[PDB]
Design a protein around this ligand. Structure first.
Ligand SMILES: C[C@H]1CCC[C@H](O)CCC/C=C/c2cc(O)cc(O)c2C(=O)O1
Ligand SMILES: C[C@H]1CCC[C@H](O)CCC/C=C/c2cc(O)cc(O)c2C(=O)O1
Lengths: 263, 264
């Protein structure tokens, strides 16, 4: 049964989190929008396969909004990793299979690099290493404009507009307030701090993905990096939000991939 | 432009339509599967103006090169095409060249780099087919009118610039209309399995590989992984499948810059 609630960690973040299942741990880190309701459907699916799945709204975002300003400013994968480790400690999650898209992927890599002992296997998806043109000036315009532009962009990168819309009014209202905050704290600092150096990529198993429908140039570098390093690399259906666009396929991937590493 | 436009019948029976412009080191522009060289009209002059002798041609059975034996456009592979092209180069007095090619054209480039390395300065393959998208799975099973309509829409949508595509002209599109069925029956089933992407195909001459920036990742995902694991220069170009049509200037610049690196 799904549990839903809050926990305040020692860094002051009042986290909204959810959990379902029993068995080895699976952690689902959201993308930059930090909205975990996006994992609702797949979470049940993954949990039903014998895993304890944990997800949460990111610091300062959605229901995890009661957080120190520091936790949503000058964000990097390593910064988020620290926060997540503190959360995992409080939740007594010793080791986990970890998923993450975009800033979430950066966080996955940071975890694999700096906290390898806590990671079974990492599943990064679309690690930002170079922003597209649409994000160049996003941190520079007024909040209403950021929301409007980012709501459109996200929908366009959704991989399934119907499913995107079908996330619901509550989710979309939360996203609306998240966009400006995300804009000021993420796109400028996330890409330059991508943990994609040789030294970050070999401590724990990694299975890397990019969206099947995502324009090649966007995450091209992820592919080259993975291939050059000898890391498993492939695609998932959809674009930036496979968990929303293709919940069944997404769940399958997580389950199958994590299963490879159980002992 | 001061461009030669002519015909030559090679020993294999193909009556080729070819174009040539400029003087200097040779650059060869191999069309994509559609085999219409008029798509290179603009960039040809641009490349030629940078000090290169540029040659192009309609592919066997296609457009103005349509007077060719059926076997030159059936059960097509990159290696088969390479054979024909080598024969053509011999008649045109081209000894070594920088070679460009997209899709089947790219398969051809690789075949040339693998099997005729002496004739290749550097190869510039773009989107080598290794696995067809679902839209092409049954394209050979239908009748010509159906193929022409389906492929004309398919090509336009993945043109990378529908305005430019349309701007090719009705003469070009009329030629294309007839090419579509021939391409379908002879290319998609055999081009992918014969992709010269094996280790031994890729290291005899310099290769600079590209994929369309706007092309869906999955389509040519394998090109990227292969190139990367093999230590081959890999990157993107604006557009999709026809950068020479969608983005003539950027295309021309890429060819020139890339070819220039290997000149003695
Ligand atoms: C919010 C999410 C998708 C927004 C739609 C946008 O259309 C996605 C464009 C791809 C870029 C994502 C991104 C880049 C960056 O520098 C930092 C980030 O946190 C992200 C990321 O999390 O993107
Ligand atoms: C005709 C051209 C583009 C057709 C439109 C389509 O949007 C191109 C989809 C990409 C695949 C092209 C292709 C596949 C193949 O197995 C053999 C080929 O000769 C081609 C090829 O030359 O593609």
């Amino acid at each position: 049964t799904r549990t839903r609630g809050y926990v305040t960690t020692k860094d002051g973040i009042k986290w909204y989190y959810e959990q379902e299942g029993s068995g080895p741990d699976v952690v689902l880190i959201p993308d930059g929008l930090g909205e975990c309701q996006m994992f609702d459907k797949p979470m049940s699916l993954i949990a039903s396969n014998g895993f304890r799945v944990t997800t949460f709204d990111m610091p300062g975002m959605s229901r995890s909004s009661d957080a120190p300003p520091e936790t949503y400013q000058d964000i990097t994968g390593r910064k988020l990793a620290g926060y997540i480790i503190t959360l995992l400690d409080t939740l007594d999650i010793k080791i986990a299979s970890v998923w993450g898209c975009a800033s979430g992927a950066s966080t996955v890599l940071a975890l694999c690099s700096d906290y390898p002992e806590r990671v079974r296997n990492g599943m990064p998806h679309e690690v930002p290493t170079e922003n597209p043109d649409i994000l160049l000036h996003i941190h520079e315009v007024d909040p209403a404009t950021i929301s409007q532009e980012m709501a459109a962009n996200s929908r366009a990168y959704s991989g399934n507009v119907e499913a995107w819309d079908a996330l619901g009014p509550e989710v979309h209202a939360r996203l609306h307030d998240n966009y400006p905050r995300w804009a000021y704290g993420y796109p400028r600092t996330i890409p330059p701090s991508a943990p994609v150096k040789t030294e970050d990529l070999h401590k724990v198993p990694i299975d890397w993905t990019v969206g099947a429908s995502t324009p090649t140039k966007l995450f091209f570098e992820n592919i080259v990096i993975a291939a050059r390093e000898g890391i498993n690399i492939g695609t998932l259906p959809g674009n930036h939000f496979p968990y929303v666009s293709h919940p069944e396929e997404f769940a399958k991937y997580v389950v199958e991939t994590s299963r490879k590493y159980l002992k």
